[PDB]
PDB file of C-alpha atoms (C1' of nucleotides) and ligand atoms in Angstrom:
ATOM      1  CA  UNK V 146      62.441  32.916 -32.275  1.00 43.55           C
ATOM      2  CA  UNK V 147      64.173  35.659 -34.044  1.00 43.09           C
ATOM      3  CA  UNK V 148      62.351  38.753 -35.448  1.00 44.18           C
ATOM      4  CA  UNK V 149      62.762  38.750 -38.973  1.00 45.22           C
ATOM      5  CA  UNK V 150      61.067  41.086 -41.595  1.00 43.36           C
ATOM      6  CA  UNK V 151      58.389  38.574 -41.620  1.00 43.02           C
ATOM      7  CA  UNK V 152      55.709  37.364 -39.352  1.00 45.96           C
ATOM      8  CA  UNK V 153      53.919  33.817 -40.255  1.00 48.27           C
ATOM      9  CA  UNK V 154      50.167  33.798 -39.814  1.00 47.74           C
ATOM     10  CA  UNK V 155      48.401  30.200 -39.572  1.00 45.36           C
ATOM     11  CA  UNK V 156      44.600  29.467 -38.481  1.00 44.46           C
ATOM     12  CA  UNK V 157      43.001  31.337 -40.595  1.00 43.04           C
ATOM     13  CA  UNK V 158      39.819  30.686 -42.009  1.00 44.05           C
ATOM     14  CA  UNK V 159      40.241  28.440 -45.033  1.00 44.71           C
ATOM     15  CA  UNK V 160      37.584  29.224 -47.132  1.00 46.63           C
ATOM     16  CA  UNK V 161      39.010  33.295 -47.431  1.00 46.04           C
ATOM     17  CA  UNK V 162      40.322  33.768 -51.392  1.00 48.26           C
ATOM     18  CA  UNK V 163      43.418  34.207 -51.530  1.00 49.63           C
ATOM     19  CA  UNK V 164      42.857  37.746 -52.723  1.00 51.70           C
ATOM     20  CA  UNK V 165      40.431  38.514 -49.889  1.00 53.04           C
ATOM     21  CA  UNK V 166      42.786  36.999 -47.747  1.00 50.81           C
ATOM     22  CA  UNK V 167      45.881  39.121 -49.236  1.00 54.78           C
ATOM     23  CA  UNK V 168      43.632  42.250 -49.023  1.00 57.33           C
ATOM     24  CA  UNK V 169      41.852  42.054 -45.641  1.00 58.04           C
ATOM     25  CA  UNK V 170      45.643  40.738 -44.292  1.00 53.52           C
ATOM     26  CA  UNK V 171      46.592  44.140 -45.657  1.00 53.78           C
ATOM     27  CA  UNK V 172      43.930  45.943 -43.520  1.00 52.36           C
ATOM     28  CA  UNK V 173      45.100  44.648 -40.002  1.00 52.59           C
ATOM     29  CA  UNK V 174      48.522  44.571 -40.929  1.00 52.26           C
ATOM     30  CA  UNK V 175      49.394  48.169 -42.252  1.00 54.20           C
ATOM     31  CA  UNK V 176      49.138  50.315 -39.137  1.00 53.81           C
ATOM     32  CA  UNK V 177      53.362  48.985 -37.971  1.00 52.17           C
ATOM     33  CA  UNK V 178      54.698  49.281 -41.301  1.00 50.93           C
ATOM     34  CA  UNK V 179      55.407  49.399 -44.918  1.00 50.18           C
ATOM     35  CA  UNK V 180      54.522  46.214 -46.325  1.00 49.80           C
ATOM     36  CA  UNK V 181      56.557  44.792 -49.424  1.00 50.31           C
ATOM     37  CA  UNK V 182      54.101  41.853 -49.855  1.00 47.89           C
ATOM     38  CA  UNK V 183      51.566  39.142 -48.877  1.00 53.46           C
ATOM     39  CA  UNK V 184      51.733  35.567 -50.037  1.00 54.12           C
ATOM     40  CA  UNK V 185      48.710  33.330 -49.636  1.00 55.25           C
ATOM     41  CA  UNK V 186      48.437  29.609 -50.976  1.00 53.14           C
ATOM     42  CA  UNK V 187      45.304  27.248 -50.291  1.00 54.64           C
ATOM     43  CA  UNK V 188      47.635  24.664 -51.385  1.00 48.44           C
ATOM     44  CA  UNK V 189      46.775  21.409 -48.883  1.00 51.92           C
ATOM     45  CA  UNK V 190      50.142  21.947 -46.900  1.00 53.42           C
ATOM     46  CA  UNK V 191      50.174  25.988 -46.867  1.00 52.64           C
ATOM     47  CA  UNK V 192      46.073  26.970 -46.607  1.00 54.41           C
ATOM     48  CA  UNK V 193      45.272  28.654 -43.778  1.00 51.76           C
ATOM     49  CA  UNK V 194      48.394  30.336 -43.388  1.00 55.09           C
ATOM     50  CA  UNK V 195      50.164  33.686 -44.416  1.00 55.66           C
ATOM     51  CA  UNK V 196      53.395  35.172 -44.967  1.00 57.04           C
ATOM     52  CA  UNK V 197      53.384  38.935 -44.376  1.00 55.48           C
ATOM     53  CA  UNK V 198      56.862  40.770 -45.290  1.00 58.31           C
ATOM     54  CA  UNK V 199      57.613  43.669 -43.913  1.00 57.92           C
ATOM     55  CA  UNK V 200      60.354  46.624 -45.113  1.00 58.07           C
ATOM     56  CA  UNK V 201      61.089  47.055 -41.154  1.00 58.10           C
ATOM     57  CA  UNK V 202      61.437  44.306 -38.570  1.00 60.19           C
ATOM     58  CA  UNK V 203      60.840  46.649 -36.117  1.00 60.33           C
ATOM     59  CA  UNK V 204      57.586  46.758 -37.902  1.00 62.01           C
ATOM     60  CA  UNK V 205      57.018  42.995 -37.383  1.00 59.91           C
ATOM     61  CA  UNK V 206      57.602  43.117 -33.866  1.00 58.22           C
ATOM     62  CA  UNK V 207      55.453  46.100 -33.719  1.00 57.84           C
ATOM     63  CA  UNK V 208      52.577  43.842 -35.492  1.00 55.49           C
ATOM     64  CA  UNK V 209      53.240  40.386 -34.176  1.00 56.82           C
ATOM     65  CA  UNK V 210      53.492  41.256 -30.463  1.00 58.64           C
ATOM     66  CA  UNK V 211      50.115  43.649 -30.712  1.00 58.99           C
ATOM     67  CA  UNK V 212      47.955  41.773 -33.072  1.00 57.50           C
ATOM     68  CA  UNK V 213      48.710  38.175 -31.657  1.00 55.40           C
ATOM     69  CA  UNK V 214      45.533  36.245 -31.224  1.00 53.19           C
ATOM     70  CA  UNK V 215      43.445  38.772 -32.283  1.00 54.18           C
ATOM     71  CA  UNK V 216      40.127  38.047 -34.286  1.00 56.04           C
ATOM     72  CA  UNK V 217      40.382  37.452 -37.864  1.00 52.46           C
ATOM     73  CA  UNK V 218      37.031  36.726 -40.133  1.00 50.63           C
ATOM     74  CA  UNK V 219      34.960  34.323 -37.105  1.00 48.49           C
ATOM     75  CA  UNK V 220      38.515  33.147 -35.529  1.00 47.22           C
ATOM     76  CA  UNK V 221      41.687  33.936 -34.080  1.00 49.80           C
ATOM     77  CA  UNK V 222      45.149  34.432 -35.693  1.00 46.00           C
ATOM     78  CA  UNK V 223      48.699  33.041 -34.488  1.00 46.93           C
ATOM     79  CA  UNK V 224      51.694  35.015 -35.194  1.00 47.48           C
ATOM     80  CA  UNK V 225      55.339  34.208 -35.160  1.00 52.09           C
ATOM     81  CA  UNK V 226      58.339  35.138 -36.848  1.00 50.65           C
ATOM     82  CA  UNK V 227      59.037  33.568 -40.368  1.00 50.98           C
ATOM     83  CA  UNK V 228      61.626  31.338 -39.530  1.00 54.11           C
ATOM     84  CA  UNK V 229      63.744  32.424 -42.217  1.00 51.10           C
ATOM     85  CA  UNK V 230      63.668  35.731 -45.024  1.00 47.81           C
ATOM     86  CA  UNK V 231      62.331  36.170 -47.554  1.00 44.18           C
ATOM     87  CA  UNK V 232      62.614  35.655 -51.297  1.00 45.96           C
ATOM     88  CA  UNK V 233      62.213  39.633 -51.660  1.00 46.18           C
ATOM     89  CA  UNK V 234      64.092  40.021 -48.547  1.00 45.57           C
ATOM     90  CA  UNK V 235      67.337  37.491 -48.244  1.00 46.59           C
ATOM     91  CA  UNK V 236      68.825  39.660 -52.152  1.00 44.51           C
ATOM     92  CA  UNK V 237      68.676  42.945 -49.773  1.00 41.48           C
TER      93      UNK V 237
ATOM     94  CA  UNK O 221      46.602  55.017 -59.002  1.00 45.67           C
ATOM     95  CA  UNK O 222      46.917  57.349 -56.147  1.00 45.88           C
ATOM     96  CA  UNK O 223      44.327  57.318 -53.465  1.00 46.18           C
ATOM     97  CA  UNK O 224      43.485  60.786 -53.253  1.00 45.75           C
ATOM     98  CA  UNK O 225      42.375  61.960 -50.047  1.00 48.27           C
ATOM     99  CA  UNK O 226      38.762  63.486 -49.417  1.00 53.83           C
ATOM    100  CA  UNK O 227      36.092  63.958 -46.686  1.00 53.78           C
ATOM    101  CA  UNK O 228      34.052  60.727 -48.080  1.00 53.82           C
ATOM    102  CA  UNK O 229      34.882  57.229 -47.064  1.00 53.33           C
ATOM    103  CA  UNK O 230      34.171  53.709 -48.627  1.00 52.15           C
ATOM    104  CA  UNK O 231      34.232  50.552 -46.420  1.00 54.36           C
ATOM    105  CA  UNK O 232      33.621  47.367 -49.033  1.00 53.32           C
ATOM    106  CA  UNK O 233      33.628  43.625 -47.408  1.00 48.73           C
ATOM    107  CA  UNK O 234      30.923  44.140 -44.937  1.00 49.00           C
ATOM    108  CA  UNK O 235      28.933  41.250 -43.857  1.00 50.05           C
ATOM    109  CA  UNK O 236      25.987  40.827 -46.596  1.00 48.64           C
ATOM    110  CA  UNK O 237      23.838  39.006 -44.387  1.00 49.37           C
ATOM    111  CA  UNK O 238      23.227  41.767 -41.849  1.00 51.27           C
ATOM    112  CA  UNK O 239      19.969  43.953 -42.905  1.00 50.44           C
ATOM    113  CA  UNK O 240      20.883  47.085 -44.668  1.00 49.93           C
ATOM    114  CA  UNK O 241      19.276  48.819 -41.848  1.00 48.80           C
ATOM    115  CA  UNK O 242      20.586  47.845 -39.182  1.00 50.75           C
ATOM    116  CA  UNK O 243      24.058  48.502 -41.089  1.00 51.53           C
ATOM    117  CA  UNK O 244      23.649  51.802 -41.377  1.00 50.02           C
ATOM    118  CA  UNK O 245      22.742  52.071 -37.384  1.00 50.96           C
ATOM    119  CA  UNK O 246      25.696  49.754 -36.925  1.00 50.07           C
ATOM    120  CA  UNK O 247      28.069  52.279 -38.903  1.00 52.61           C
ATOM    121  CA  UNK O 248      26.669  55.624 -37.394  1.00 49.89           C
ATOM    122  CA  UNK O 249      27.206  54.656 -34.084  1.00 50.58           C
ATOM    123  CA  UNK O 250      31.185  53.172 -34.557  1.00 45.85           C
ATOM    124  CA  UNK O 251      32.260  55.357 -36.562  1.00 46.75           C
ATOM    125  CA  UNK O 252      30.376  58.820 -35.017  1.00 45.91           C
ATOM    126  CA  UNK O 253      33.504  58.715 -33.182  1.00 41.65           C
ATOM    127  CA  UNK O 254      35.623  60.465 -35.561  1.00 46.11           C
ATOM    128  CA  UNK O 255      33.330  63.536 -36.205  1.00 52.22           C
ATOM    129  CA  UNK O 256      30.514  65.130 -38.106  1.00 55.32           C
ATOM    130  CA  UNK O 257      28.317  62.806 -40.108  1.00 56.92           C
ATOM    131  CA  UNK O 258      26.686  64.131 -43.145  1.00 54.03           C
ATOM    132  CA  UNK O 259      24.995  61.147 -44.070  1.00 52.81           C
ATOM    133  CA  UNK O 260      25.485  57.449 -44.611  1.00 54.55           C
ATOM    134  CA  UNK O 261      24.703  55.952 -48.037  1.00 53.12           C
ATOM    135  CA  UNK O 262      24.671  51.866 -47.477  1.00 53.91           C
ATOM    136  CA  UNK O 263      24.296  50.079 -51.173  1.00 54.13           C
ATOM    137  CA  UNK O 264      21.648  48.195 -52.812  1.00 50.48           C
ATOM    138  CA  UNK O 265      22.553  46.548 -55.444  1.00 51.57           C
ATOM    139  CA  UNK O 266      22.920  42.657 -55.835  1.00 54.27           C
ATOM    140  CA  UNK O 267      26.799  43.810 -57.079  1.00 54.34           C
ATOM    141  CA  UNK O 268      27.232  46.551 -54.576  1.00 52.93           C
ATOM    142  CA  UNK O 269      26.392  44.364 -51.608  1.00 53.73           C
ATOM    143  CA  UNK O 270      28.421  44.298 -49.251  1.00 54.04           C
ATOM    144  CA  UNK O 271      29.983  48.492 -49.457  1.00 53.66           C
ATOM    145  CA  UNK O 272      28.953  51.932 -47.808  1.00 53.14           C
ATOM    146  CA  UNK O 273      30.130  55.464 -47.935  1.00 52.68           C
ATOM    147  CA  UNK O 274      30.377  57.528 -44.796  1.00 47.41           C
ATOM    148  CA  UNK O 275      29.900  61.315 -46.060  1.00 50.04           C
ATOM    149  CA  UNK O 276      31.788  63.234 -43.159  1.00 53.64           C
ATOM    150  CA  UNK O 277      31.886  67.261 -42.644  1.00 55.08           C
ATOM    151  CA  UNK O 278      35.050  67.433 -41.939  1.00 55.51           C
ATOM    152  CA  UNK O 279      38.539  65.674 -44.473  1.00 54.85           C
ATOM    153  CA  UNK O 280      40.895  64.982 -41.268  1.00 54.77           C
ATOM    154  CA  UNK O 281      37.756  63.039 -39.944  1.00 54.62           C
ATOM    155  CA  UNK O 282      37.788  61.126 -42.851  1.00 53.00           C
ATOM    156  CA  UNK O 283      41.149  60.515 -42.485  1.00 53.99           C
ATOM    157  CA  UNK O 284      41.143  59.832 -38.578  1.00 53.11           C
ATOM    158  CA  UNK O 285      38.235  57.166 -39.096  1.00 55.69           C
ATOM    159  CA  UNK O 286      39.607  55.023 -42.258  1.00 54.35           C
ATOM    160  CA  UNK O 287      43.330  54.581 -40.232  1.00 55.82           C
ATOM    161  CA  UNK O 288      41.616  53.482 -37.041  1.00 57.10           C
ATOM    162  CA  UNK O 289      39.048  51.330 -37.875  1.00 57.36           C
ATOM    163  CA  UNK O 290      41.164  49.686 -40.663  1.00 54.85           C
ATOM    164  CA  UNK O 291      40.721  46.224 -40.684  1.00 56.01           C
ATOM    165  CA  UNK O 292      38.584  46.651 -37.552  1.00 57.66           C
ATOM    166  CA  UNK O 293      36.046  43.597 -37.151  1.00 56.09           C
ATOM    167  CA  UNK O 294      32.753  43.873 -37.937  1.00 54.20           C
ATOM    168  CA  UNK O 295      30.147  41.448 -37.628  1.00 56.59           C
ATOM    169  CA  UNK O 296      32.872  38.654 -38.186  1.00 56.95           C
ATOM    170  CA  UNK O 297      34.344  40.346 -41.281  1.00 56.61           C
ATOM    171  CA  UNK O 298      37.343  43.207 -41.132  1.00 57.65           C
ATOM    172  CA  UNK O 299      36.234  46.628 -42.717  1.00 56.57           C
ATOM    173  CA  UNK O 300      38.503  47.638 -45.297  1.00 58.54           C
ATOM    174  CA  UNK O 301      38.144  51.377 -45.870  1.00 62.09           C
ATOM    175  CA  UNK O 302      39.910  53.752 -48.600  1.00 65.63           C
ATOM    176  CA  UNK O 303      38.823  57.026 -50.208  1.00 63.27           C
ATOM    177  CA  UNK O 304      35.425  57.532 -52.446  1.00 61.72           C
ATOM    178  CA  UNK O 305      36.843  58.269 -56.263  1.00 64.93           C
ATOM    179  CA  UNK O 306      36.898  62.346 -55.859  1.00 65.02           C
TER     180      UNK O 306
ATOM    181  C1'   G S 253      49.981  29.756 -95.152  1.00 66.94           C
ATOM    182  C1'   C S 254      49.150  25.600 -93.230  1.00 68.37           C
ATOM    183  C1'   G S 255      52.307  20.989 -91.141  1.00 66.10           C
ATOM    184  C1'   A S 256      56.118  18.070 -89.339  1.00 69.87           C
ATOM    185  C1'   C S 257      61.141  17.454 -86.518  1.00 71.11           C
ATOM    186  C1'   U S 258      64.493  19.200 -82.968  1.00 69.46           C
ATOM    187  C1'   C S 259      65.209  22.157 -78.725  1.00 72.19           C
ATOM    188  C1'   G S 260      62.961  25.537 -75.648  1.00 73.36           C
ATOM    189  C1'   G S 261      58.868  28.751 -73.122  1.00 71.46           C
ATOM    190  C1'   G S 262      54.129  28.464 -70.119  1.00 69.50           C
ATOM    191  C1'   G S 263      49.696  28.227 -66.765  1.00 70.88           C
ATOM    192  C1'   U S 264      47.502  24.882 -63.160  1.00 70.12           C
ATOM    193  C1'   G S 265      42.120  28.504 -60.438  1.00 65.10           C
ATOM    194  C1'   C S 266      36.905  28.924 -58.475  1.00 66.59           C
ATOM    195  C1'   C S 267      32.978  25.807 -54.598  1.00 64.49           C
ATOM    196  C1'   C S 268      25.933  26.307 -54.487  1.00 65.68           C
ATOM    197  C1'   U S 269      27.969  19.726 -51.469  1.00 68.09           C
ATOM    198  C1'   C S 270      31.028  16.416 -49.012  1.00 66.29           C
ATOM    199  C1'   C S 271      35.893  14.188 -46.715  1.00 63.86           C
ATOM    200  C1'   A S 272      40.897  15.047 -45.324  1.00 62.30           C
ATOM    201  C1'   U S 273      44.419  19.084 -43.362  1.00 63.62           C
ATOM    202  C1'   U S 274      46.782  23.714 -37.993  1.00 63.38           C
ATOM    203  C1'   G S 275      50.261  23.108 -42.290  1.00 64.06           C
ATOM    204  C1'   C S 276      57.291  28.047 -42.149  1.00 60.88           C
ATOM    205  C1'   A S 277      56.590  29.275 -47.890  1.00 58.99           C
ATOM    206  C1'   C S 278      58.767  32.032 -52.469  1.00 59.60           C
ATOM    207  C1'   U S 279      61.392  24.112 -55.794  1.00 59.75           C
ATOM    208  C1'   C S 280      54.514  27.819 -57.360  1.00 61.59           C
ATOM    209  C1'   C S 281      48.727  20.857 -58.218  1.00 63.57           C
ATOM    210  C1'   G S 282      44.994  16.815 -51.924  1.00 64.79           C
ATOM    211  C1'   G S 283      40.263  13.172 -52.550  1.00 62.46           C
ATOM    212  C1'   A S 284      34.734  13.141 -54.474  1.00 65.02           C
ATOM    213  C1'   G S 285      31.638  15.556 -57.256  1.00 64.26           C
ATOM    214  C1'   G S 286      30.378  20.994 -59.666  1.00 63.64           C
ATOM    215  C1'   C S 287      32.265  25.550 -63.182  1.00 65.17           C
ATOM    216  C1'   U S 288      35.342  27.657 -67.220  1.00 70.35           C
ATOM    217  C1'   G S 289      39.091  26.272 -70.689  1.00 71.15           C
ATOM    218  C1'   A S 290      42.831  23.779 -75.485  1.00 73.92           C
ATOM    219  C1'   G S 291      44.934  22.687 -70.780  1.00 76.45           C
ATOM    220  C1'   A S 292      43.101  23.671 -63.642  1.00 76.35           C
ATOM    221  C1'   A S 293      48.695  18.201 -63.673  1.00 75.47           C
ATOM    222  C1'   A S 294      50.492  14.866 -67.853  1.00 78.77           C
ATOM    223  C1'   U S 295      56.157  15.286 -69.830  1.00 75.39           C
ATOM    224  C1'   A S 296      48.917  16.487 -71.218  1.00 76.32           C
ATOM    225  C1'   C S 297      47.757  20.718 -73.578  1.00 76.42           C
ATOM    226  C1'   C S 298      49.353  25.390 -75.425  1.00 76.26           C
ATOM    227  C1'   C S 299      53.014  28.547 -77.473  1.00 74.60           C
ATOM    228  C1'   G S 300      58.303  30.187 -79.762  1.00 75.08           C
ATOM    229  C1'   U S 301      58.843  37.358 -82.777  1.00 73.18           C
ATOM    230  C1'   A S 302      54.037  37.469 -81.389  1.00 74.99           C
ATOM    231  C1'   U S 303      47.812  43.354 -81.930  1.00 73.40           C
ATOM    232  C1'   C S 304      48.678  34.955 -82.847  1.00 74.16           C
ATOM    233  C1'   A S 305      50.898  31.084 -75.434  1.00 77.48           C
ATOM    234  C1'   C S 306      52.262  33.266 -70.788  1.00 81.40           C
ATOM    235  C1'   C S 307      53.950  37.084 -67.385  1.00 81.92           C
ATOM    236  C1'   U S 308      53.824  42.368 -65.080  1.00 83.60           C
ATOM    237  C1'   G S 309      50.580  46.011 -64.001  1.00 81.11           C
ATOM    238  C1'   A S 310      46.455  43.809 -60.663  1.00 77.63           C
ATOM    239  C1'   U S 311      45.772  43.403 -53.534  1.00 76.14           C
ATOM    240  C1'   C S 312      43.344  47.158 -61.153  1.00 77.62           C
ATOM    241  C1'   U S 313      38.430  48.686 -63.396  1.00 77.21           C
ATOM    242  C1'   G S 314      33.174  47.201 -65.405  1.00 75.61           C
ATOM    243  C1'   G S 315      29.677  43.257 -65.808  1.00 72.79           C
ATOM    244  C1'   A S 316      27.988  38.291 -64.604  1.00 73.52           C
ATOM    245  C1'   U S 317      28.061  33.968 -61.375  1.00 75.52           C
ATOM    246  C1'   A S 318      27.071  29.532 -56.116  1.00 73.84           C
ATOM    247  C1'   A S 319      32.161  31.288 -57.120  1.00 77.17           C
ATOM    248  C1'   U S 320      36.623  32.350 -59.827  1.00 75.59           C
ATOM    249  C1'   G S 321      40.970  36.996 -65.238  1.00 73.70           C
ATOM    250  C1'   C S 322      34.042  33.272 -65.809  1.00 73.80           C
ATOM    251  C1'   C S 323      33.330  37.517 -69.695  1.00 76.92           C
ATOM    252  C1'   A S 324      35.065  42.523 -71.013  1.00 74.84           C
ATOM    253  C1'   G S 325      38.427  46.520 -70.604  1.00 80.93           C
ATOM    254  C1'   C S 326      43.544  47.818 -69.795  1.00 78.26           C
ATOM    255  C1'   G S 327      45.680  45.366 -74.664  1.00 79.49           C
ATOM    256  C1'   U S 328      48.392  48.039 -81.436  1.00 80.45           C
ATOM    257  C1'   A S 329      50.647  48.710 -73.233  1.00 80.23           C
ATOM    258  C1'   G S 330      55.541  46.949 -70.949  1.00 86.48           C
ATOM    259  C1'   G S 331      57.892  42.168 -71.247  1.00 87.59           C
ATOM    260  C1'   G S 332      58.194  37.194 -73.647  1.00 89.46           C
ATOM    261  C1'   A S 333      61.199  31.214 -76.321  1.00 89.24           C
ATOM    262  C1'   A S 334      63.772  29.609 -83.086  1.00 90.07           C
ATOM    263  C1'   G S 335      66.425  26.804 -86.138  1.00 89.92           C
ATOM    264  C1'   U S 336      65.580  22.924 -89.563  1.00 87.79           C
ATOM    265  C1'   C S 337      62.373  20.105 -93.319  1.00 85.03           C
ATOM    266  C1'   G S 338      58.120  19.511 -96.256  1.00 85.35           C
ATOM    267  C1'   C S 339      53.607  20.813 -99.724  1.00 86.25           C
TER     268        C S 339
HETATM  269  C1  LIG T 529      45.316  25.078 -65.509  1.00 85.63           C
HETATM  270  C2  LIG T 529      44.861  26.264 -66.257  1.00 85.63           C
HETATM  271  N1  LIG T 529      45.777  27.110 -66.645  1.00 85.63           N
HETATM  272  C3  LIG T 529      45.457  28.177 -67.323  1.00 85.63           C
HETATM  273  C4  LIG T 529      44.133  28.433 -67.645  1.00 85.63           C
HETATM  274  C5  LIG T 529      43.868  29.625 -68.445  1.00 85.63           C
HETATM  275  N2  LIG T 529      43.865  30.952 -67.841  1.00 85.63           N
HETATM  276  C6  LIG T 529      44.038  31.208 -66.550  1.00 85.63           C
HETATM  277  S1  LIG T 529      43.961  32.944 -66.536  1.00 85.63           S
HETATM  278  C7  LIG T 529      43.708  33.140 -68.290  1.00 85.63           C
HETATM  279  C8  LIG T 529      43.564  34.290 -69.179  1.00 85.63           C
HETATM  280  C9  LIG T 529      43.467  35.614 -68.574  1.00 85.63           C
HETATM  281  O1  LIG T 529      43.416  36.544 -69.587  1.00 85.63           O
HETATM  282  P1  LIG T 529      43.310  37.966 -69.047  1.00 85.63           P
HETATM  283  O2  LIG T 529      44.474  38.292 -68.201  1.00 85.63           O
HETATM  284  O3  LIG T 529      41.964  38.134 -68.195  1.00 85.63           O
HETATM  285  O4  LIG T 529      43.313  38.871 -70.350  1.00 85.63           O
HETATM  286  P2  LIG T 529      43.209  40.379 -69.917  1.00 85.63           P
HETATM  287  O5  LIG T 529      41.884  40.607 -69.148  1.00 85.63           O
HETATM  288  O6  LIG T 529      44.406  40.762 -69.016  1.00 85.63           O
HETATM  289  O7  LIG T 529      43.219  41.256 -71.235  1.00 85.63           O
HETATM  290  C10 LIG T 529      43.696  31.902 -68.703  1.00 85.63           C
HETATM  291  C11 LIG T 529      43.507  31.617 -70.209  1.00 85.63           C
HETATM  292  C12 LIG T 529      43.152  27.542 -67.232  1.00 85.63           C
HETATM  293  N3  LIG T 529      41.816  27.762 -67.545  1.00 85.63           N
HETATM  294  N4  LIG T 529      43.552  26.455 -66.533  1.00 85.63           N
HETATM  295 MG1  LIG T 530      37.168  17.560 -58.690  1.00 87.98          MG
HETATM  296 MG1  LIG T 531      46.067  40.863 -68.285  1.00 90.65          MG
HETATM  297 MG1  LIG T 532      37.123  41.568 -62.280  1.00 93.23          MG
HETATM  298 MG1  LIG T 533      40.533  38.628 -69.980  1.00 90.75          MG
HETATM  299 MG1  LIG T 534      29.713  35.804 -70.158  1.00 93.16          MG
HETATM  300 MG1  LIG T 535      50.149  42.452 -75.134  1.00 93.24          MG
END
RNA sequence: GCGACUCGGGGUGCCCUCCAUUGCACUCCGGAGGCUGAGAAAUACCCGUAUCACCUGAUCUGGAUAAUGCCAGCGUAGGGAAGUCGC
């Protein structure tokens, strides 16, 4: 895939808030880059997963490729490039 | 805000089922890594469960130890660290 | 001041217990049962100049709860959709 400002995080626990989620997502995350934003929803088809947008894409490189299958609250965490930008991110 | 930086740090969504104890142990040893410990102050309180303060001598320690560990797994729940209020 | 009509604005979460799901979103709702609410999915409810819906702050602060804007604060904050008819 192509890096992209934006990594996409799936099998994570299910029963993390949304807002735990978003801010404990911000704690393993932050070390690459400058995050613009998080976006969880528990929403049947998108729970469990993540979208994490970063200002960089170096950034998301420099998270995906080190954090990838890493723990994450009792399991691991997959990682791969959003497959397209963002919202926030395409009006740039 | 503004997170303003000082020698005292606060971890918050630790694992509430682990004996207060036996956190503070737990917290000396991983984060005596980073410096001088002054003292450890785990909470009490059936709306402070879960959060600690790590008191250290030295501000850069501080500093050193919140980056790091950040989002660092402990006991199948990621620490989440920032500044105590001043 | 209530109230109609017309058109428009808006939110849709939490899990002490179960089942289903590994899902590439910004077109923002799975099933049972439980909680709050007017409403947590229906063109249902609510609202249209507003200290009288809702948003942004907020990944905010304080308290409670199984848990959640569940209750407070912030909040005379910054935004936010009007004409017509009738007593
Ligand atoms: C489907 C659904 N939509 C909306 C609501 C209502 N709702 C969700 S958040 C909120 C109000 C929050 O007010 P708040 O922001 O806490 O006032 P503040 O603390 O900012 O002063 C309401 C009424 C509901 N109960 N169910
Ligand atoms: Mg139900
Ligand atoms: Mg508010
Ligand atoms: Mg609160
Ligand atoms: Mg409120
Ligand atoms: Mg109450
Ligand atoms: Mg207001």
């Amino acid at each position: 895939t192509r890096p992209n400002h934006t990594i996409y995080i799936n099998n994570l626990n299910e029963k993390i808030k949304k807002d735990e989620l978003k801010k404990s997502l911000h704690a393993i995350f932050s070390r690459f880059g400058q995050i613009l934003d998080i976006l969880v929803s528990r929403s049947l088809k998108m729970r469990g997963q993540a979208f994490v947008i970063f200002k960089e894409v170096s950034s998301a490189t420099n998270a995906l490729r080190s954090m990838q299958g890493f723990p994450f609250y009792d399991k691991p965490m997959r990682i791969q490039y959003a497959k397209t930008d963002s919202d926030i991110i395409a009006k740039m």
